[PDB]
Symmetry: D2
Subunit: 442 residues, 4 copies
Amino acid sequence: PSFTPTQLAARAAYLLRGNDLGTMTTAAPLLYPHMWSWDAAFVAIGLAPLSVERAVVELDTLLSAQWRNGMIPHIVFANGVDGYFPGPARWATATLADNAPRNRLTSGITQPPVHAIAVQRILEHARTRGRSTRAVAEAFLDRRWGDLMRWHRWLAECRDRNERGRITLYHGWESGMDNSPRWDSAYANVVPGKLPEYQRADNVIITDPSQRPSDGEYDRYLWLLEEMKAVRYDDERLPSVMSFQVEDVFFSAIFSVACQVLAEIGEDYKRPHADVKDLYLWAERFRAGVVETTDQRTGAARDFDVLAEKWLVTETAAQFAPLLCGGLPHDRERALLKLLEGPRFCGHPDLKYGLIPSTSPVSRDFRPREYWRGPVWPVLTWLFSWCFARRGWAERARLLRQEGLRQASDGSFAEYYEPFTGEPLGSMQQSWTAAAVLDWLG
Amino acid sequence: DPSFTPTQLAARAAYLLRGNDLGTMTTAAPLLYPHMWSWDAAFVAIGLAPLSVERAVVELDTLLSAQWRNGMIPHIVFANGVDGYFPGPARWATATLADNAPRNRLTSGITQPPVHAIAVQRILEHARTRGRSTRAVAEAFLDRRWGDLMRWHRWLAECRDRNERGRITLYHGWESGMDNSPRWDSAYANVVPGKLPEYQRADNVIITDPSQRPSDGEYDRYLWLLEEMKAVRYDDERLPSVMSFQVEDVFFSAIFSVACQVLAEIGEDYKRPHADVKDLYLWAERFRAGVVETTDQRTGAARDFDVLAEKWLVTETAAQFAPLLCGGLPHDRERALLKLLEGPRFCGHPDLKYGLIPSTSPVSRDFRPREYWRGPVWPVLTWLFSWCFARRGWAERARLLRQEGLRQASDGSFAEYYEPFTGEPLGSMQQSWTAAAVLDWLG
Amino acid sequence: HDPSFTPTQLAARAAYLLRGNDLGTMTTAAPLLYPHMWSWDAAFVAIGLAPLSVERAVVELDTLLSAQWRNGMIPHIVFANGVDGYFPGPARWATATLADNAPRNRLTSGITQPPVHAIAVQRILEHARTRGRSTRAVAEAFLDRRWGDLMRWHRWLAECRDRNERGRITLYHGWESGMDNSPRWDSAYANVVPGKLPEYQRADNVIITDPSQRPSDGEYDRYLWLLEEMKAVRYDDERLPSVMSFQVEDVFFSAIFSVACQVLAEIGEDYKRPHADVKDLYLWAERFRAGVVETTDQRTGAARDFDVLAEKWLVTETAAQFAPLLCGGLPHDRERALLKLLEGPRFCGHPDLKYGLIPSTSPVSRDFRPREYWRGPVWPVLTWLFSWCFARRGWAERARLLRQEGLRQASDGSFAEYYEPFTGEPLGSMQQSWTAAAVLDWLG
Amino acid sequence: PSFTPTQLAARAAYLLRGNDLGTMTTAAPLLYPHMWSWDAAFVAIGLAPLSVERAVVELDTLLSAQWRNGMIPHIVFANGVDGYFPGPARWATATLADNAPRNRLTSGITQPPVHAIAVQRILEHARTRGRSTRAVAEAFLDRRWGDLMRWHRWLAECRDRNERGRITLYHGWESGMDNSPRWDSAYANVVPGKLPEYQRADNVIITDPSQRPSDGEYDRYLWLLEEMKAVRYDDERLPSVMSFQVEDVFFSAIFSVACQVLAEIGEDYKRPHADVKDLYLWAERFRAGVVETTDQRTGAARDFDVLAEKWLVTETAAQFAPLLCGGLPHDRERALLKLLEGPRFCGHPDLKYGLIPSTSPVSRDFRPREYWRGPVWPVLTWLFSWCFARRGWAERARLLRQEGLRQASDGSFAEYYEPFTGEPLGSMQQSWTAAAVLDWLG
């Protein structure tokens, strides 16, 4: 049944090279047959124990698609691949967005900046390998430190215009949790006008409807595209016209952590002092911004609906944003860690593994099979585990790792798993799942 | 410390293998060997089996799709449209001259050892551990290809042992897999080339260190044998009369004995025709005896035979140990032979970095610590020896080879061969059967 | 969630147990149930100790061999001085006063047990070869000191327990088989009619109180009756055959002796022992391999035991049927058939088994009892023995699969004497020394 | 040559059980034939993977030697052994120290408080082992919480009389680094008067004089014994008469850590709030007291000679005390980390392993074989590695662990190793070296 550690690490590496199109790795074989932004950070993490040179290539490809205003788009499309919707033709960024790259097709929205974490792992691997391998990673810093700064500066200046230290989203897809209950009350206020016809491609691949978002949800995902296109993806116009404007507390906590990670890399590798100062200021700002959202009793973080001007209260894994980035008073972080481990999340009596369900099994929003409405996601298990280790919670990080691997031992490298039975769901051969396994072992 | 952990090493080896995959064939190395080779493809299938039984099966189906009509599996199946290797499809000219060559694969004109039954066994053993749909894939490969395998073994037995001596005749040193072994030096010394059409080497464009590859003089004789074969359209019935090189390869013969027995047990387990299993056992036994008849009375060491000179070939290489693979030596001679293996002419030599088997003894005048088959340590041989020893029931001795094999492989170079004293990787890096050996041990 | 130990955790725990059962120069088979040294547990303890300390492993066998009777028999228990909790103890065997051949300076039992000792010597020697010159010297010193002793142990089996030269070992007590209550011995035991049996109190079922896991009182009455029988003739080898109510040829023991003989012969060649001994060992290796083959079913290859009193073959469905797999000898077709029986649904392939492992009794036999000692449970000592013999036949994958599943089963860390075939519940004594030894060797 | 991880773990547990005298483990089979206080904490850490029950026994036996005033004596002598000097007779503690326990026989001095760390490791193993094992550890808490509090309160109140946040030592033996260059200048002002004759036993067992302190140093060590003896070991009278009085900044940092670790336990298991508040108070006082020693450029921590009233500058592993407990400003800590890597320590070109030598190889006090004057000590690698992981420095802690296992892969379980050749030194079969390996793999 279950593969040994060497078998599993081999089958994961075999998977990662098999999803490699040449200079970009698709996020899955068929369902996501393109380069996605946060997956590509994870693919670089997974590739770094295999080939520092090729992990660097993965980040160099994504950054070559960076928008002129600094935004890393959430998709970089593979030349001449179909199979996915909405494709280049639906976004029309090449024709409508003055900031879109001249020589890459890309989407029009962003995604969380996990990228600095991938740079850290590459550097830590490279330092354990040759002098020539350190030279490759250090040359990659020399080449892309500016691009990474523009990425972080664009988030902080253009998606936190009021310096609240939370990132604004104009599309639920930018959160990475497309159908999370976090966004349900925001989406209920999105009223599509004349929606141009389309046919989904995702549920041609994953045909079980219980596992993917609904048609109605997709009608709202694509309407938001029309609103964006109408204004040519102009940052200065989105606030006026978008029917979806939310402050994503999970994305912001990730941003806080990334700025700190990048700042320490800037210190270690003698990057400009003004950059490190900006990174540290953003780190602290978005840490404070996460904490301001948090429940008084449990420390759980809240999303904010900018249009409705109300806190979003749901019971998902994003409530734990503050654990990633710190800043909660000591007492309230204990409360939060107890919520994490208690029967609403990791301690629910029915879970096969001691892992974080995307939505709490006790919430009325919970759906054991439905994407971000409850399944266990290895990508989140890794991110939480790496961030916990970084907080100095060595044992808590080890247990996540240990259950992560045990769940991963079937070798399906599933996109997500059913919380109660462990059945693999979503795409098989999902690249960032294989990256998580490879980072934990490699 | 430059060394990888076991999971790091197994991952890099799998990443290597998929990186050498052109689609339905795996090249034997990135650049040096940018096509499918016959016995490398067997090992690649062994290395692939823990990754994907389905894709391991594809590798063997691809090689068998290039099998000649008389049953010979040629030693190269060229990739469509690939240069960078000489002699290429144009030099062999089998596409136009060999009546038996396949109509839809480009291939070489010579054969290579029948390690393929061993890969089938590993595929079947992995597939039996991975559930019903995976066993079905392996079983259906057996249904499609049992005949081809039988024709492969029957061509060796009937066409390369036409006197029923139990030893496989070669017409080219390349068929042994040890191109420049000291095994063939006296045979090659009697190969006088005629008007050899000019050519330029490709191999030493990629491996430029001349100490690591054969000499121009050796290549001149390698290509001349091609010419003798070409002039006769690769016709099995003409080769004995015209070939300037005709040797009995005791190591190939021992492999064939082991393969016949492996294939026969597979035939029994999977209800293949009884008459086929009988044939396989008969050949196993005959080639076991033929290997033994070559052996030294004191040490048990096996000898190759020069058919043209009518001479036993006495050299000090790892092929001497052929009878260890296939058994049959009287108990006391096999003890002497193991004593030779473990003592200072070979594994116990005091200057070796690892307890592994050099391709030529470091005490032989023929020894060269960098030169291909004239001394370096070859991971493919470590694996074959280790797998065969385990099968003999020598669990500990098979374990020690495996252990030292992994230590040597832990630089991650997956080199084709290593310098015996310093451990320096030599030949092509990223060599597919070295990666396969690592995967098999840990997979 | 996961109550399993990692391999390094399990290995550490196994070595920790093994050291805790060490009384100084002998290891107890278990902490409480078996608080003395057992002959074939001692061979496995030495196997377990070789990756930790070749010196202490050599000491364990030295102590055992210091208990060897004057005629060569290795008795199955060497009692720890002054320790109780086990019955029958030295006061009941009375061997210091009744057996002319007991050792002057050791309290021991008066029966024997299978000769796995040579396998333990092979494992010792293999480890010491890997450790360096000083360690190889310790192991070689042990061979100079003990080779004659080992030969006398083997020659006593060959001459005094195979007197008609049939290639099979006669036992006078089921305890000598190592499988006390195996179904194998039920019909022979049915002909043991106790007489005046001096009263006694069991100690084993005070430690293991569950009666579903141990032999019955009536079996113990028959066990203690045979003691009275051989005690009545001063444990005299020449007198035993005319007075013992239990006289069986053990085919499993016989195959083990065949293996041992070959193993010890090969040690003898490597270490230049007297040529006369090696030839004798090769003679016994062949004689007992043939004597094991002679028992086998012409269709299935299954080996049978023999009741020499009833003059009847013992057909039962226990792990012992597979004795020919350990020693070789069967014709090709007979051995393929036997393997089919082993992996088929009557044994390792039974659909309700938790692990792919050999149950001591076949789950489809009417004699099957899933908890009751040797009438069904999975014994890690048998899994190791089968695995190590399998690898030695060259069945690399077959032996790997048993080891793999043996480690899965032991990965609970109980180091149980035996496991429930269906639920995997640990049964028997916890902290059983040879179960710890199996894990250590599979990983050390 | 080198053992596999499973072999080395089996051999480490073998050694540990063989040094078990029943309810106490000897720090080594012959050189240290009694129980030592921080060895005992490390033994409990090494036993936790094998037997939480037996690990709890180890600390019960230690705390049963706890003096009436709270002090944990640094040696609990085994009944009957006489192969070590100074023994029961030379300490005269069972007659001269009014706080020495009844029925034990202990030293008259203390050793660093690593014990809370052993308690946390025990609790972490127990939480992964199920309900009965948890109960064992939580019953140890109820039994021993007051005793641990008393051990911390004695150090805070009686060894920090001026509330300076640093521990005062009256014997170099109390640092665990007997002949560290750290103490040379304080020892040089110890003039031994009428020293009763004695014979060392330590150099009977370890014959090479290059690996053990000199006779002149043992004279000072046995003279400090006479001073506290002549005053009946009375806390109130020691400062008036002791001619060796140093603040030990490494010990101080360990206390800081221990206090924070025991505070967190106290919160987790609902101990009285007053103890938790006090522990957090001491953790901060000693964190501050450690930071107050440090060089404003490098961050290197200094010890302080109370009699001479001057800072003790040496280049030993102790300089890195602040890395354990936190506190330093960001720039100073970066500077101190560069000192720890880099050529004067872990980064020295001639080191066989990337490990921290007890003395800088570039110090003029360096001696590659001489106890604490240079060699690499597996106890310090474990301590540094575990504290590093607690700071969130996952990779740094992983490199020491990796190198520490590679060095221990000989299976000698040596007390210390030659930094350049890797030669095993000191006592072989040293219990806390075996414990370090077990925890790193248990």
